[PDB]
Amino acid sequence: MKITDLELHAVGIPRHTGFVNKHVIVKIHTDEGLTGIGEMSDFSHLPLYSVDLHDLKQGLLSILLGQNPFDLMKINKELTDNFPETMYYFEKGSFIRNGIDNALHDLCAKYLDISVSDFLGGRVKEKIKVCYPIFRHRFSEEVESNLDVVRQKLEQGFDVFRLYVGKNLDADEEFLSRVKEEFGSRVRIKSYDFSHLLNWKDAHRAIKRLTKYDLGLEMIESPAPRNDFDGLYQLRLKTDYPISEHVWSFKQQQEMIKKDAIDIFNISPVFIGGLTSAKKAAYAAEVASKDVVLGTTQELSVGTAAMAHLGCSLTNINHTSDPTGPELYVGDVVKNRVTYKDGYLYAPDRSVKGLGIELDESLLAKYQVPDLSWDNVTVHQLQDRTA
Amino acid sequence: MKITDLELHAVGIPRHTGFVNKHVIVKIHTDEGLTGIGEMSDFSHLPLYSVDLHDLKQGLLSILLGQNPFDLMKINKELTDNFPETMYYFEKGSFIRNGIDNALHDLCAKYLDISVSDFLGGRVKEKIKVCYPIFRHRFSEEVESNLDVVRQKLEQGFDVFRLYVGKNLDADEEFLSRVKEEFGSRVRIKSYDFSHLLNWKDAHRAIKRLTKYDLGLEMIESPAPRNDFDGLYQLRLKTDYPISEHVWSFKQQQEMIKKDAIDIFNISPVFIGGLTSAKKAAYAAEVASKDVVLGTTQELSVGTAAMAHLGCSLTNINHTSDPTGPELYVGDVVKNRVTYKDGYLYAPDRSVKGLGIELDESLLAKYQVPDLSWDNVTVHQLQDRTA
Ligand SMILES: O=C(O)[C@@H](O)[C@H](O)[C@H](O)[C@@H](O)C(=O)O
Ligand SMILES: O=C(O)[C@@H](O)[C@H](O)[C@H](O)[C@@H](O)C(=O)O
Numbered sequence: 001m002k003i004t005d006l007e008l009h010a011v012g013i014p015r016h017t018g019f020v021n022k023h024v025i026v027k028i029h030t031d032e033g034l035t036g037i038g039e040m041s042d043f044s045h046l047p048l049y050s051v052d053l054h055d056l057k058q059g060l061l062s063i064l065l066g067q068n069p070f071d072l073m074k075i076n077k078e079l080t081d082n083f084p085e086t087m088y089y090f091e092k093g094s095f096i097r098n099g100i101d102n103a104l105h106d107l108c109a110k111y112l113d114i115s116v117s118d119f120l121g122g123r124v125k126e127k128i129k130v131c132y133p134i135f136r137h138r139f140s141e142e143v144e145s146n147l148d149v150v151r152q153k154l155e156q157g158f159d160v161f162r163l164y165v166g167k168n169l170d171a172d173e174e175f176l177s178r179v180k181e182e183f184g185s186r187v188r189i190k191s192y193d194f195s196h197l198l199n200w201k202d203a204h205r206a207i208k209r210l211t212k213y214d215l216g217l218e219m220i221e222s223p224a225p226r227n228d229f230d231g232l233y234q235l236r237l238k239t240d241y242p243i244s245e246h247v248w249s250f251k252q253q254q255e256m257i258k259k260d261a262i263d264i265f266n267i268s269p270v271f272i273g274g275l276t277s278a279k280k281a282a283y284a285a286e287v288a289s290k291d292v293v294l295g296t297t298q299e300l301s302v303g304t305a306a307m308a309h310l311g312c313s314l315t316n317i318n319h320t321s322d323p324t325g326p327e328l329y330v331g332d333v334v335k336n337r338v339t340y341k342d343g344y345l346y347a348p349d350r351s352v353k354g355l356g357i358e359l360d361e362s363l364l365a366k367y368q369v370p371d372l373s374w375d376n377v378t379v380h381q382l383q384d385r386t387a
Numbered sequence: 388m389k390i391t392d393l394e395l396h397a398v399g400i401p402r403h404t405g406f407v408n409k410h411v412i413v414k415i416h417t418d419e420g421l422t423g424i425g426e427m428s429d430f431s432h433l434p435l436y437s438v439d440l441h442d443l444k445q446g447l448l449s450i451l452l453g454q455n456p457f458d459l460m461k462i463n464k465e466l467t468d469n470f471p472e473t474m475y476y477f478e479k480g481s482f483i484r485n486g487i488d489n490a491l492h493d494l495c496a497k498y499l500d501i502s503v504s505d506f507l508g509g510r511v512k513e514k515i516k517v518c519y520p521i522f523r524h525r526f527s528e529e530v531e532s533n534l535d536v537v538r539q540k541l542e543q544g545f546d547v548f549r550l551y552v553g554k555n556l557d558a559d560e561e562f563l564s565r566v567k568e569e570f571g572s573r574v575r576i577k578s579y580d581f582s583h584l585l586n587w588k589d590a591h592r593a594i595k596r597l598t599k600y601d602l603g604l605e606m607i608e609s610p611a612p613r614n615d616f617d618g619l620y621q622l623r624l625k626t627d628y629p630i631s632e633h634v635w636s637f638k639q640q641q642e643m644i645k646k647d648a649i650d651i652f653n654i655s656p657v658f659i660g661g662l663t664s665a666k667k668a669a670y671a672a673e674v675a676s677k678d679v680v681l682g683t684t685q686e687l688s689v690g691t692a693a694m695a696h697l698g699c700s701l702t703n704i705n706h707t708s709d710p711t712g713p714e715l716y717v718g719d720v721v722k723n724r725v726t727y728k729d730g731y732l733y734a735p736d737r738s739v740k741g742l743g744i745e746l747d748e749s750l751l752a753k754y755q756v757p758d759l760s761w762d763n764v765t766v767h768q769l770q771d772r773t774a
């Protein structure tokens with residue numbers, strides 16, 4: 001059982017709201033004709049440079065060629081050797097490793113004729129509660145449009161949301177005020193995500209005013225600069241609500257655990273390098289008696305299915321999670337997208353071998369892009385995912 | 388005075404020893420016809436992917452077009468906004484910002500008809516002592532060849548070297564023993580560089596063994612994993628010799644300062660984003676009463692000229708530095724390469740406006756490569772710069 005070839009399909013898929021993201025669909029072929037499919041999700045984050053895919057294929061092939069896909073520890077070690085963790089939230093190498101590792105999970109599962117779910121420790125639940133993201137308010141005139149989003153998504157089944165905050169506290173506060181007034185308790189906003197925009201003391205003042213509105217609030221996310229472990233800790237001591245932060249490297253995670261800097265570890269395959277690495281991170285959190293939440297970069301159905309299997313296998317996810325990618329994109333590259341119902345993301349049919357997703361070649365062609373080059377976009381839009 | 392265009396010239400230049408590095412020569416054009424030259428030095432470091440230069444030029448021009456090159460603070464802020472610091476030694480975004488910023492210095496200095504030296508605070512010295520690098524020993528069988536290197540370079544005038552260690556302690560020690568034996572005190576090895584290969588305790592044991600050979604030893608560099616501030620600190624308390632570490636981000640530098648983790652800050656433009664960023668790092672070190680050494684990624688004459696001017700302006704460099712790029716590369720892209728004599732790097736003629744170097748178009752064409760794609764190379768070779 002050996003890897004013989006690799007394909008990287010670049011696609012560009014816009015969100016209903018306008019932001020255009022580029023992703024790379026992975027295909028790992030083997031001597032026995034079995035192919036694993038994966039996804040290097042959302043490369044459209046800073047830094048503002050793009051990776052040469054022709055060169056990348058050669059580099060990845062040199063690593064993968066001839067290897068036994070079941071040697072996940074060995075392969076992941078070699079992947080990290082060539083694409084080291086950087087202590088950066090959006091390291092493109094993390095997205096790359098993620099795509100190879102989840103494709104390998106698909107491959108192995110298919111070979112054994114089982115769902116990736118059974119390859120990750122089975123099921124603890126069959127679905128995980130998620131939330132729909134509400135855009136960061138830059139100006140107060142945006143409040144009305146965001147309220148419309150909440151009203152429509154609620155009718156569609158999403159009763160839990162998360163709100164990006166920190167740019168215009170007056171606008172954030174007006175939105176929250178309006179939401180409580182119109183929906184009362186019908187809607188919950190489980191997280192206020194600062195996106196590392198404020199120093200911890202400024203975030204503290206912001207949190208103090210935003211928490212005057214508690215619509216089923218579950219956590220305050222990234223309320224300090226990236227890697228400001230001491231700041232997170234000081235804020236954790238001054239905040240009644242749990243503090244959550246993304247895990248983007250093992251070193252960063254180790255430091256947050258050792259300093260007891262946070263309460264909830266936001267873990268997502270794409271930011272840590274794949275399912276193998278995400279599992280390690282999740283288990284490290286478990287060993288430290290810490291809570292976990294499944295984060296997201298907002299991936300397509302392949303990437304979402306992968307994390308759905310992982311999320312449904314963990315015993316330490318006791319809060320609302322974030323992956324709602326397929327709900328944001330106007331299209332996808334699969335025959336059947338993952339399912340969302342009543343605000344829950346369902347793990348794919350446990351009876352279907354592999355990820356439980358099938359690629360649609362006509363869609364890969366439809367959304368094909370020549371490379372991962374950037375289009376005109378501002379820093380504000382890259383941070384808020386707006387257009 | 389406004390920026391009107393940008394050119395990025397990829398070049399591939401092998402070292403006498405075999406390793407082939409790719410660099411990017413920068414040209415910033417203005418409405419008045421004045422052009423600044425710069426260098427994005429040595430992209431040939433992990434991660435194993437490459438940046439699309441056609442895309443990069445568009446992104447960089449988007450930032451630079453129409454700007455006044457004298458607005459260094461404003462431009463560097465916008466550069467950092469799009470190519471953020473990642474807490475990673477070899478972030479390619481740092482190499483990119485470095486090339487733009489040193490080109491801007493060349494441009495501004497030329498416009499005013501002065502050397503970049505007078506734009507950076509003048510001179511404190513006219514030359515800086517540097518050292519020649521000795522390859523990391525992976526096998527004891529390499530000792531002989533490395534001794535020949537010392538013999539040859541000493542004859543050329545390099546009486547100070549630095550040694551990469553940590554892979555084969557028995558070989559490291561054999562080499563050091565042989566050097567002392569064959570050269571006595573004629574040669575000095577100012578630094579033993581562990582390249583972050585060992586956890587601090589293992590490093591402690593290695594140091595205790597190696598420091599039995601003190602041939603003018605000045606510092607122990609990177610004796611702990613990347614960003615292991617507490618490990619660096621613990622080692623600083625158990626080691627009599629100064630501990631030095633590279634500065635790859637302001638967050639990392641501030642944490643090392645706050646924890647008094649190291650004694651010497653190894654600062655080089657390429658790893659921190661350019662001359663503007665390197666000056667800030669050097670001044671932060673000065674404010675903290677810390678020593679500084681001019682590090683290197685081994686750049687061509689354009690990049691070496693830039694750092695030479697910086698190095699000769701600082702008052703807190705009281706140890707041997709590392710830039711010997713033009714002595715390692717078989718070729719260059721300039722009319723006259725920077726001068727090295729008796730183990731000293733001389734800053735370019737202070738009477739020559741700009742960086743003090745001139746591009747040789749025929750050489751630029753000679754070493755031109757289609758892109759920054761990777762060729763066959765192993766992780767060991769990338770960390771040891773061997774072939
Ligand atoms: O939790 C967060 O910070 C968000 O999921 C953040 O990662 C977004 O930028 C996301 O990646 C997106 O593209 O919408
Ligand atoms: O001090 C160091 O770690 C070296 O200068 C290191 O950066 C080398 O890898 C250098 O960049 C080279 O290309 O030789």
Ligand SMILES: [Mg+2]
Pocket residue numbers: 193195221222246
């Ligand atoms: Mg978040």
Ligand SMILES: [Mg+2]
Pocket residue numbers: 042045296297298
């Ligand atoms: Mg994303």
Ligand SMILES: [Mg+2]
Pocket residue numbers: 580582608609633
């Ligand atoms: Mg070093």
Ligand SMILES: [Mg+2]
Pocket residue numbers: 429432683684685
């Ligand atoms: Mg280098």
